[PDB]
């Protein structure tokens, strides 16, 4: 049946080529020989055999067979290398996680400078991204690695969230200790920079706000190399962590250790004055320092900016594919 994963062979796919270096293996583009469908294959190597099958991949399998949303990436099956099978011990072939192929990734589209986002385009992008995050958050999962590289876009204008390798379940009642260095510094929440080991789903909201601003500037908002420098850059724009705006900031491991140069005022509305009013309010609420005062995903979907966006009009982003060749 369709459900007996792990037995079908990778012979069933014509490999087209390598599209990226993953975490637990390389990622290939391939075409199904039977249906002609295009797929992405994440290769999982258990030959490391220090901890066997990678937990990163286990998370992605465990979670993505539960999550069904148009804005969440779909795992179609798990297939295997041709096994000599003289003995199960001799077998060292790898496993492949079969996903739907997506035309582009957001980082590629922005880094190549080949995309222009209108307001109406940003609405479609953000409505889908927040709706998918809402589905995950309402199902009590945290992504914990939201970056432009992990938001995939096909030319239909459909957005899908993708790298669930760092995803874990969140218990609101019983707080659990997690890993504090979870998101890439550019998209990391301020709470985790100050060492919050018991973090909330608000970490993902922060990342998406960073993307919201970036789509309006085409440059990442907070680009730094070290955790302190980011806190300064965030503080310069969002305001310095003070107990006035973040009453429990005093309870964070590195609050006294890590301080911005000054006590900064919030200038988000000034430095982002070129953003539409409806969007600026979304950014100010999403990039709120205190995770407990930071808006939820649902609250973003019930905003003047995204509430009345209709996803029937997907409004794909503008990609030049001719006259880009010659100026």
């Amino acid at each position: 049946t369709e459900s007996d994963w792990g037995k079908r062979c990778v012979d069933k796919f014509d490999i087209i080529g390598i599209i990226g270096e993953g975490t637990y293996g390389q990622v290939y583009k391939a075409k199904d020989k039977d249906t002609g469908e295009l797929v992405a294959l994440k290769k999982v190597r258990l030959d490391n055999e220090k901890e066997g099958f990678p937990i990163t991949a286990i998370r992605e399998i465990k979670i993505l067979r539960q999550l069904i949303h148009r804005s969440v990436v779909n795992m179609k099956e798990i297939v295997t290398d041709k096994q000599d099978a003289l003995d199960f011990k001799k077998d060292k072939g790898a496993f492949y996680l079969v996903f739907e192929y997506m035309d582009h990734d957001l980082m590629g589209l922005l880094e190549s400078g080949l995309v222009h986002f209108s307001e109406d385009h940003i609405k479609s992008f953000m409505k889908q991204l927040m709706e998918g995050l809402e589905y995950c958050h309402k199902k009590n999962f945290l992504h914990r690695d939201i970056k432009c590289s992990n938001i995939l876009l096909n030319n239909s204008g459909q957005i899908k969230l993708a790298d669930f390798g760092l995803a874990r379940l969140y218990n609101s009642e019983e707080s659990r200790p997690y890993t504090n260095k979870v998101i890439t510094l550019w998209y990391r929440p301020p709470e985790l920079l100050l060492g919050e080991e018991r973090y909330t789903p608000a970490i993902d909201v922060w990342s998406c706000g960073c993307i919201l601003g970036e789509l309006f500037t085409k440059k990442p908002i907070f680009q730094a190399n070290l955790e302190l420098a980011q806190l300064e850059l965030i503080s310069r724009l969002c305001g310095s962590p003070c107990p006035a705006v973040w009453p429990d900031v005093i309870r964070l491991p590195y609050f006294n250790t890590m301080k911005p140069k000054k006590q900064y005022r919030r200038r988000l509305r000034e430095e982002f004055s070129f953003i539409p009013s409806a969007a600026l309010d979304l950014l100010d609420h999403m990039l709120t320092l205190d995770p407990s005062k930071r808006c939820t995903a649902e609250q973003t979907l019930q905003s003047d900016f995204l509430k009345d966006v209709e996803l029937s009009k997907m409004a794909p982003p503008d990609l030049p594919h001719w006259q880009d060749c010659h100026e």
């Binding site: 080529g17 599209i19 583009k29 880094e111 190549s112 400078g113 080949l114 085409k218 070129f274 060749c325």
Partner: protein, 826 residues
Amino acid sequence: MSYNYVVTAQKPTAVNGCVTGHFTSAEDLNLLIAKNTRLEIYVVTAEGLRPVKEVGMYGKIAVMELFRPKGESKDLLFILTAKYNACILEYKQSGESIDIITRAHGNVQDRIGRPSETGIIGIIDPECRMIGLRLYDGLFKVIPLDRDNKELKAFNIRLEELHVIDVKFLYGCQAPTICFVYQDPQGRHVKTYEVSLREKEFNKGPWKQENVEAEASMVIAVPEPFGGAIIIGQESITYHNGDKYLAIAPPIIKQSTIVCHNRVDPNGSRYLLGDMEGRLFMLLLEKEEQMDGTVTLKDLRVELLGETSIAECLTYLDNGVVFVGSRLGDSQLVKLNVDSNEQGSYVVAMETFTNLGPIVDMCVVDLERQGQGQLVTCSGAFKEGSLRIIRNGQKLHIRTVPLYESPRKICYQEVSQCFGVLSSRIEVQDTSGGTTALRPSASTQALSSSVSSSKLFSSSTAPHETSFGEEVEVHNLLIIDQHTFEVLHAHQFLQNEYALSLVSCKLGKDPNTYFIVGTAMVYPEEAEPKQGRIVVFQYSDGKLQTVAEKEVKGAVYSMVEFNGKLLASINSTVRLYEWTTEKELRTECNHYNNIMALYLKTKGDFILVGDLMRSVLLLAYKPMEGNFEEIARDFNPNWMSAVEILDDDNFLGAENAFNLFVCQKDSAATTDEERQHLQEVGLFHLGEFVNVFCHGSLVMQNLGETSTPTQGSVLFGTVNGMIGLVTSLSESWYNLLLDMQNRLNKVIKSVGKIEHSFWRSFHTERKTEPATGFIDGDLIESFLDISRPKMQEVVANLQYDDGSGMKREATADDLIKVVEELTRIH
């Protein structure tokens, strides 16, 4: 890691801006001409220009303006670079010693902002109270020009109008006032605001907004006798001042877009206007004085003067002599006469300044069997299109072959003693239903001619409607004699067929040498071409014969000969064709993992593929199997402009951001994943747009030249005419030259106090990285021009390593020898 060296063989030749003023002395009339990264200072004489000084800046010159604040005897110069380095400069001369003073400087970049569509705009107040900068959508930056602002500190005023087309400071206003055309969903409008340094905000401007032409392009601030502003569009010119409103819409200007303006008469009575078909107009302001004693603008008139080069900038100088600064063709001095000549023209050319123009392609060929090498370039555009033959002999000798249409690709075919050149010319839909060319050109003045009769796409049934007056491109293959550069033949391709790629080669067991062209069927409706041809021609006995055609489902962006097979890239696909004994192309194998395979290069059985957004890929032919294999890909996202193979392991690429990079196979080889990773080992901000990489050199390499430390030779052509050279170094030589750069940067004084390390840092809107693996040869070659005290300072404590001596002290005369050798590679 990899070590490479990059030098300039020909400096940028395109004029990017020109101003006139009193910069060198309060007495002389100066002409300041800006080429990319280069500033040229001239003094106006009765015969022409007297050059006085040229400086380089560590930045692309984006804004250039002269101002004279109260208290200064002479004009000061403001320059802003494309990386947002701002400075105020002064000319100072002590007898024979000429130097440029940096009076104020700083970087005005904002942490947050969206770069505007119409680019950086910089303007200065008529009272020189402030400098206005339009860098980002929705923001206006003010650098107030107070004596104390030596760091050029500035503040931003929120600007409600996000999409600004153009802005100028107006004359005759009680406060500093800006006039700007902007675009919102309701069309384009002209609006005015007053700028308050005291309040650091806008106040309501003097005259109300008016709705203007949908394609309103340029704003002119008219001098105080009239006051107000003139707005130039595609069809109309309008003057707005207070309640006064005029509009002239003469049919002559609708024919070609007007791109430049300049004031002839300081009272504002007369202006020059230029258009993209090269026409030069006079815009006349007709005065009417009232009995009150006030003078009002009565009417506007436009008069055609003649023809110049397609000009980016105009400057009137004086005595009827105008400077035509070109980016697409040669620049000029032209004289405007009061009386027309017998042809009806008031314009007569005086001098012609060479511009290698846009270099769309080029090849190196030893025409005279002199073992030297000559560079034949596809240069210029539209009526300025030309071939340029460049040889060394101390200056470069450049011959110009006018084509009067756009050259696209060039390739040399020795067997036929001629060149093949792809070209396109503009025709316009005319009342016959066909099209008519605006002027004769190479593809119409060929000795013999032919037209494709291919039936491949003739089925059609796809409607493409035509409106009178619309432009079309008509593409041709030109056969051009290598000694006379006469156009021997011209082959016109199908209607709406673009010629994109050209090779000259033998295939298979076929002894004939063919010209092969790859094309694309371009319809306005299509996002990406879905039809195309590979055409095999034979040039024989003065006629071009069509040997074979292969239909493809896309655009043949790039082709290259591959061990007797034809390697072609069709959209995402990279294909290898064999040439059968039946003289037809047969597909052997394909590689599909691309977004758009724009560029191809080969070495042996290895192929380097340049993609629109996915950087460069190393593909390989496996002859035992008859297919392709992916050796390694650069996973850093980059928008490629050109690529080249340096050696079996190092690969050179050019970015659309004016950056260079070198990739190398990791070659660790522990795991397959590392091998499939091309590591970016070289990063370098060139500052030019590279269209073509080409292996070769123009230096006389006949037996007897002393061995150079540099190994290899890649020449490259750019949009601004700049020609450069990339070569490799040994680890020892790099470290020496790199250590010497760091010493030279401490010693050499930069114009605008721009840090050299900043200038060459890899730069996109999203990233900035320090340069690596690249020696700025132009810096190294400046050691020979610095004063002796500075030379010994540079060589102090300089220890050579990894050589005959592990530690070797360096003297200045030793480096004078090394740098002089490094100047002999070009």
